[PDB]
C-alpha cells in the first residue's frame, strides 16, 4: 500500500 504503514 502507498499509505504510511501503521503500528506492527
Amino acid at each position, epitope marked *: *500500500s*502507498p*499509505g*504510511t*504503514p*501503521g*503500528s*506492527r
Partner: antibody, heavy 113, light 113 residues
C-alpha cells in the same frame, strides 16, 4: 501523546554539513510508521526530503540522494538528518514528521558564510 | 516526479460560508486498491502544517468535520464548510501515490470582512 522535536544549529556555512536531530517522545520509533524530513523554503514551497522506516530502511528524494543521509538511534527514539555540501539554496525550515499526521514545530536553518 | 498544481494562489470567504479549494495532479492518483492517494494540509501562520484529509476523502484524527475532501483521478477539491477565523492559513495538497511525495504550491484562505 506522541510528539516530535527538531534540534540543531540555526546557521551553517556553505560546503559544510547540516546535522539535525528529531527527538520522539512517548513513542518507540521501531513500533511502526515512516519517519520523514520535510523542509519549507523561503517563499513557502514544501519539499519531501526522505524518510527512515520502522525497520531503519531509508527512502530519499532523488534530487537529494547524493547529499542526504537519514539515520536513527532506536535506543534513544531519535532519528537524524545529515545534508552534506550545503549551499544557500538549503536555507529552509526543517520539519520532522511521523507519517503525515504528527509534525514537529520546525527549526529554521540558514546557510550562509 | 508527479507535478501538483493549485491554480488559485488565494481565496476569500465570508465567515460562516463555505469554500472549495482545487488541486490537480499530472498523473492519476488512483490505486488498484480503490484508494486515491491525495492528502490535504493546513498551515496556520507561524505553525507547522497539519493533516486535514488523507486518501482524498478521509478526515484525519482531531480535525473538525467542516473539512471534507472529494475528487477523481487528477482533479481534487477540499471543501471547508462554515469557515471560521481559525481556518486562515495556506492549504496544500500532496500526492502520496509515488516517491518522491510532492506538494502543490498552496492556496491561502482569506477571511472576507
Amino acid at each position: 501523546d506522541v510528539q516530535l522535536q527538531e534540534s540543531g544549529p540555526g546557521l551553517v556555512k556553505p560546503s559544510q554539513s547540516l546535522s539535525l536531530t528529531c527527538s520522539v517522545t512517548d513513542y518507540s520509533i521501531t513500533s511502526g510508521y515512516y519517519w520523514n524530513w520535510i523542509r519549507q523554503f523561503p517563499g513557502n514551497k514544501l519539499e519531501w526530503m526522505g524518510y527512515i522506516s520502522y525497520d531503519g530502511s531509508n527512502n530519499y528524494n532523488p534530487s537529494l540522494k547524493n547529499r542526504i543521509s537519514i539515520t536513527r538511534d532506536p535506543s534513544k527514539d531519535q532519528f537524524f538528518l545529515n545534508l552534506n555540501s550545503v549551499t544557500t539554496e538549503d536555507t529552509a525550515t526543517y520539519y520532522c514528521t511521523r507519517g503525515s499526521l504528527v509534525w514537529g514545530q520546525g527549526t529554521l536553518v540558514t546557510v550562509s558564510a | 516526479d508527479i507535478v501538483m498544481t493549485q491554480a488559485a494562489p488565494s481565496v476569500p470567504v465570508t465567515p460562516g460560508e463555505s469554500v472549495s479549494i482545487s488541486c490537480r495532479s499530472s498523473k492519476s492518483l488512483l490505486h488498484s486498491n480503490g484508494n486515491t492517494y491525495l492528502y490535504w494540509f493546513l498551515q496556520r501562520p507561524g505553525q507547522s502544517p497539519q493533516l486535514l484529509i488523507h486518501r482524498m476523502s478521509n478526515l484525519a484524527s482531531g480535525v473538525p468535520d467542516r473539512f471534507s475532501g472529494s475528487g477523481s483521478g487528477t482533479a481534487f477539491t477540499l471543501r471547508i464548510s462554515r469557515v471560521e477565523a481559525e481556518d486562515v492559513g495556506v492549504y496544500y495538497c500532496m500526492q502520496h501515490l509515488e516517491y518522491p511525495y510532492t506538494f502543490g504550491g498552496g492556496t491561502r484562505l482569506e477571511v472576507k470582512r
